[PDB]
Every structure is written in structure tokens, then in C-alpha cells.
């Protein structure tokens, strides 16, 4: 339940508060053009974009209130992670997720970098009681590691059917091999 | 998930309960208040009480959710159909959790054979472990899904196996 306050809105969307300084959303969904964020002014805060993932380093602590967790780049491939996905009317609703690799993919009418991953719900995920809809952009994807909770990037994309996810992650490389 | 079906679940005994109809009601058997004499003020000799096991069904002698459509009720949900939990919690939040219904079955808690629909909840790779499933309170919130253009409820909750993500949904007989 800490959990899910460190999702908010943000822009078009949602960002997640890994730690009380830093805080995580998709690209595609910041204001542009912004003087501040959270009245901190623009130009003391650390903006790093990679591909749709946006990492935002305030000068001070400011949601004081959370602990640091651990920020990862993607999930090691075959994990089953969680989407916290949060709604505008009121819902708290976790989507598993079987994580792939990291790769440049041709979704939603253009180019994303980031993690691939499939809903476990799955063929009828193209309904949004199962799956993403626009807007859960920014939503985080964790999963847990023994004891520790691991966020691995935030929600960015998905296909028309709704099956396909794509992560934002900090910083994604997929290898791969010729066979 | 639409608020008008949100708004049917409310708190019943240790647990909650849905409004079917105006008139009808369901829930989970063990939730229910021992030795009541009165359900919602309704003297319980009003009342039709249909029990199959875990699953309860109320038929209230007036209508009393006047504000609510008859809904489709089912004897569950034919197996591999992905379903929707939808859990309220008593601090206020909606958590819709996504489950897979497998088949008919049946465990022995606390010595007594409880039997229903079984599911693995779709919200991790362990729900229990991330407290991301269900908990004790949660028996009663309905089991629902869209076929169509109508939501079905298949039952209510009433148990869970510990340490995962299987559930079980109690139906109507």
C-alpha cells in the first residue's frame, strides 16, 4: 500500500517515486516546456532521458515520506513482473507480466526502445478490466527479489491487441545471436 | 468495472456481499453472522436463505437496492475463462485483481472440506508474497466478467492457498 502512493500523475500520465529524490515516468508524458516540477524549479533538476524512459534527480528530498528502493535496468528475461497499473476512477490494479528483451519495437504507429513483455491475461487483454490502456503510461513495473522490491522501468507502450507491453527501462541493450 | 457494479459490493459479517438484483444477494457462507436475527434490519423469517456450501444466496422479501439492475448470475465460469476479482478493501481501496478460473475442486481447511471454482490470480508471479492477492475480509467480493456487452458474476470469494496465487470462488449449486 506504501506502493502505490508513490504513484502519481504526472502530465498525461503517471511517474513513480523510487526514492525521495528520484522520480521516474515515461517520456511522452511530461509537460514540454515546464519552469518547474512539483515547484522545484527546472534548472536544478536532473533530467535524464533514454529512449521513452525519463529519470528526474530533485535537489533535495522531497517525498520524505518513502524509502530508497532498488532501480534496475530491465528484469532478467522469463521474470514475471507486476505492473502497479493505477486508474483515474479509483483502481489499484496489478497486471502480471512475462518479461522478453530489450530491443527497438514497431508499436503504436512508431519506434520504442525499451523491454518487451506479455500480460498473463494474455489473448483478451485488448479490454482495459485486463490489460493497458493509453495512459497508464508512467505506471512502474516491479517484481520481488527475496526481500526486496525491484522496480525495473515504467509502462510506455502496447499493442493494438493489448498482449505486448513495452518497459521503459533506464538503460536497455538486448543481445542476440544469429542462429 | 464500472461504479455500478463497484457500488453493489458492500460489507456483510467478517466479510462483504453482492447485490444481484434489488431483491437478491450473495456471499460467502462462513462470513455470515451466526445467530442473526435480521439482515439490513429484514427479520431473517423474511428471508429465503439458499446455502450451497460455501456459496449463499438471500432473497429479500422486498426489493431493497431499488437502485440496481438485475445482473446475470452463473454457476461459475466455464474453465480458462480470465475473470476479475473485484476486491474492496475496508481502508476504501478498489483492487480489480485478473484470475484464470481453472476447474472444480476441493481442499480440507480447518478440517472441513470446502470445495468451489478454483483460479491463479494474474497480478504477479506470487500474489500472496507481494501482497498483491487477496486477504482475510476479502471473502464475499464477486467474481465477474464481461461476455459481450453484459458483466456475469460466477460466484463470490472464499478462500485462498496460502504462500501463492490460487483462489477460490464459491457457486451456486
Not at 530508497?68 to 497499473?85: C, F, N, Q, S
Not at 493505477?86 to 496489478?94: C, Q, V, W
Request: include cysteine; aromatic fraction near 8%; charge should be positive.
Amino acid at each position: 500500500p506504501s506502493i502505490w502512493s508513490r504513484i502519481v500523475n504526472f502530465g498525461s500520465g503517471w511517474g513513480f517515486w523510487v526514492s525521495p529524490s528520484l522520480f521516474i515516468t515515461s517520456t511522452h508524458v511530461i509537460p514540454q516546456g515546464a519552469k518547474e516540477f512539483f515547484g522545484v524549479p527546472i534548472k536544478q533538476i536532473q533530467v535524464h532521458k533514454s529512449g521513452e524512459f525519463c529519470r528526474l534527480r530533485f535537489p533535495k528530498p522531497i517525498r520524505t515520506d518513502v524509502t530508497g528502493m532498488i532501480l534496475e535496468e530491465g528484469a532478467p528475461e522469463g521474470t514475471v513482473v507486476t505492473l502497479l497499473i493505477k486508474r483515474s476512477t479509483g483502481e489499484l490494479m496489478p497486471l502480471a507480466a512475462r518479461m522478453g528483451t530489450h530491443a527497438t519495437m514497431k508499436i503504436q504507429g512508431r519506434t520504442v526502445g525499451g523491454q518487451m513483455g506479455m500480460l498473463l491475461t494474455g489473448s483478451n487483454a485488448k479490454s482495459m478490466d485486463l490489460g493497458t490502456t493509453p495512459g497508464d503510461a508512467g505506471c512502474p513495473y516491479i517484481y520481488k527479489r527475496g526481500n526486496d522490491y525491484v522496480v525495473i522501468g515504467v509502462h510506455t507502450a502496447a499493442a493494438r491487441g493489448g498482449n505486448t507491453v513495452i518497459c521503459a527501462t533506464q538503460g536497455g541493450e538486448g543481445e542476440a545471436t544469429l542462429e
